[PDB]
């Protein structure tokens, strides 16, 4: 029986979705589930290794990662477990390589910058964004308001709207206390934001209208996510988020990996899709 470790919150019962699924028609799949916070491991270059949960130990043959491997908030650093999993040679979705490299939002943005550079604005409208290695480079902005995003954090954390020079200077003084990097980008007066996802070969576009209706995929939206899905060796599960300004201009602000939240009326379909995806990946091994 093949052991699949799914790093995810307890709500979604992954064992339920993998129930009955078999590799090559007879190799059963056992599902072990737990959050990053309850895991630890030890890996040997020789191949031996063990993942400890809660305390029960297991040896996953594969891993599905649905949780953020890193957050600059307290207790959110799980990079060393990602390193350990890679060290033990365990295959995963998304790839451990992409997971590790997704641990710095500006590092992932840089990849889109390169994409934007090749494709041009009419094909890939990447939002205008500025990167600051530290607060010392934060002096002012061309226009206001702007959205400042501090360090590497999720669910709105560390993201503030700044309406003027004085406030910017204050916010910059706060970046100094985070002792990390930050970005600033034009605040978009949005009519709504859209997220284009891609799981394996399935695509879906959702329209949500400061901080849900499924729409039709377009060739434009497909290009956005197809191009983004190729970074860091390829992302099996990813999505592109863009803001649609009242003036009709689109602005791509981010690309998410395998921890992207499932949304809308089809969360069930998407989980099954992820299951189909992981089963196929496990099959090849």
């Amino acid at each position: 029986a093949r052991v699949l470790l799914v790093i995810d919150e307890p709500h979604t019962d992954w064992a339920k979705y993998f129930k009955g699924k078999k590799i090559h028609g007879e190799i059963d799949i056992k599902v072990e589930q737990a959050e990053f916070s309850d895991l630890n491991l030890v890996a040997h270059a020789n191949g031996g290794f063990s993942v400890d949960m809660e305390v029960r130990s297991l040896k996953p043959d594969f891993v599905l990662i649905r949780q953020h491997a890193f957050s600059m908030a307290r207790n959110g650093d799980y990079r060393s477990l990602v390193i350990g999993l890679q060290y033990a040679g365990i295959p995963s979705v998304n790839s451990l390589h992409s997971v590790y490299n997704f641990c710095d939002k500006p590092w992932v943005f840089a990849q889109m910058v390169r994409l934007h550079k090749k494709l041009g604005t009419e094909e890939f409208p990447l939002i205008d964004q500025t990167f600051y290695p530290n607060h010392k480079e934060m002096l002012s902005s061309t226009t206001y308001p702007v959205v400042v995003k501090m360090g590497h954090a999720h669910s709105g954390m560390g993201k503030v709207k700044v309406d003027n020079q004085h406030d910017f200077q204050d916010i910059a003084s706060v970046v100094a206390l985070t002792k990390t990097y930050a970005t600033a980008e034009p605040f978009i007066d949005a009519k709504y934001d859209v997220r284009v996802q891609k799981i394996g070969q399935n695509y879906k576009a959702y329209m949500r209208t400061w901080k849900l209706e499924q729409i039709a995929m377009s060739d434009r939206y497909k290009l956005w996510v197809d191009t983004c899905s190729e970074i860091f060796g390829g992302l099996d599960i990813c999505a592109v988020e863009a803001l649609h300004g009242k003036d009709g201009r689109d602005h791509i602000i981010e690309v998410v990996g395998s921890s992207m939240p499932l949304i809308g009326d089809h969360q069930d379909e998407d989980k099954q899709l992820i299951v189909e995806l992981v089963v196929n990946k496990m099959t090849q091994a």
Copy 2:
């Protein structure tokens, strides 16, 4: 043999000049060494032995010269949560070596957490009452989790331990407060929130030894932070009111030789004390040269007592 005095301060002020010709007991000369925290290190032995190492730029070659100070004057902030602003171990080292200081090393170490110092003012306020010691209403949050909301807006949020306006922001509403709380989570430290005061001006009452001065500061750049941007300073008369403020605060942590009390003066006529600073308070106004001389007098007298 000359007594060695180490002054920890930025190079803008040349203390050697101010201590020139000052003698202890009339015949002992004072040799002044000066440097910033960033260029200092030391080693201290329980038996009394010790050495202070100072990095100096002697013509391109980064040279380290060691000294054995008999006394120390601390004019720089020993701690800041900004990168490279943590000099607490040097303060511990100086105390470990038993070096006398101004202000006392004990007070300096205990001044490394603004809310910890503020707690002393809270005690003094419960004791003296609002009429005589109008401490501002402030709330202390050990971490971001307890930052849910405020009774009134706008509020001024002060993150961790920092200076010169660093880490302080004005928040006008509930939604913005929640965003700021999420930022606090990224600083991974404590934070305080206090009522934003529409101030006519702010004032600072200082006490150097037995010399008192009060200054009023007004912004002329539309900065609610009057220490940020150009502003106007006006020295004002000392009052019994101002004197009580700095006298009572000057007694904390065993006694502060150099200290000051900052208060905001509302447009509605109400005063609000927001902080007491130690021996690293910036000299201000048009009497800075006098204050430096007052500090020499104080230090020389403290050195004589040893």
Copy 3:
């Protein structure tokens, strides 16, 4: 009913030890107990405040601190809670001031360095320790072996025996990764080590028979000498006074004593009089609460 918050692990049922105890003869005492890791609070300059536990909230009239307030190990920093309690103006044992100042072992040691300078080696034999603000000052050592103690940690953590120059250099390079200070001191070929404790006005001395801290060891309560009493009485005066404290010393095979540390109100209770010590602590707390 006065509320007493006891910060300690659950192995000790403080509610039981305080059961029946009343202040002034009629005011009952309500005991709330929890570890630092399960606590949070909010304090206002106006006197308002709340301590949140686990989630249930309380308003302690007094606190007894039995847990280390600071450790450089991950998750061990509770200094902000000690600041909060002081900000809320809550009385404590030991005093919150002393607890805060005990959060840097070398800072505490510095107080003993002064006592030693006043008393003299014959009265107060403080061990020959060296303080390094950071690793850059860690070059060598007069003698070997030495014991290096990194940062601020407990129960033997971060402490290592170093036998030679080269090993010292390697260990110094590790201090660099801790990004904090460290101390070095002569390794004592100890016959045994002793701990002289003082809880209120009750004194006890125990002899324990290289880290007698780690693994199985034997304890023998020994007589208090005036010498021992002097060590703990003087150390008990630092930072405004310690209601609970103990001095640790190493006794070398050559007959010499070496004081290596004074612990505060979170000192572990040891030997066979631990129940009595808890009872002495209860008496102490009740006396303190009565005066408020």
Copy 4:
């Protein structure tokens, strides 16, 4: 319009000297700008605009290329320059080694993992990777099968954080120290080495040096030691060739291995473009690096 090359290296090597007279496509000049990570900062815009600020006066530049000779990360205070690497990539500035490999080289265990893969593929005979155990944090550090071992704490250089442990009691003391570093660590068999070897590869040039101590230290990079260049073998060529393909390709790299007294080799690490130049051919290596960079610059 001369091309700007920013070299991130310490003042010792005068890179401008080595690039003097070199021109792209025959006529385009190359201006060399040099500085250490500590004296650099920058700003990058998604629109392409950007600037590098060097404390020389705070002069600012717009490198057309970058050569990185300095470690981008160290867990010692002030050794974290990862955000500058991210910044350079955000600005889309070509580099040697690739900024991608530089960023991924900021965790020794992450790189070692790559060498684990190659070992699984190649076998001990061709790729004798040392027996190493990775610990995410001090909690899994219970004991060792054999002693003595070498504990390598977190991510650091020049011997920092590396200690020899001769027994269980000492392993536990060191485990408690790791707890204080609040990071990962690895443990590996201590090798009674006759000497240790390093096989380097710069572009298409290979070299192999052997180093042995003479100051009494097991860390032969600490104290007086003797270096001796030796002959390249196909065994060595395989080592550096295989590792040079990781993270999209390493322009400059080397594989370090220990040669036990029992005759066995043990590979312990692969370094990137900030590997120190050793031996009697440092001038030649700096020249090979100039050629490599000139070529890379030519292609852009």
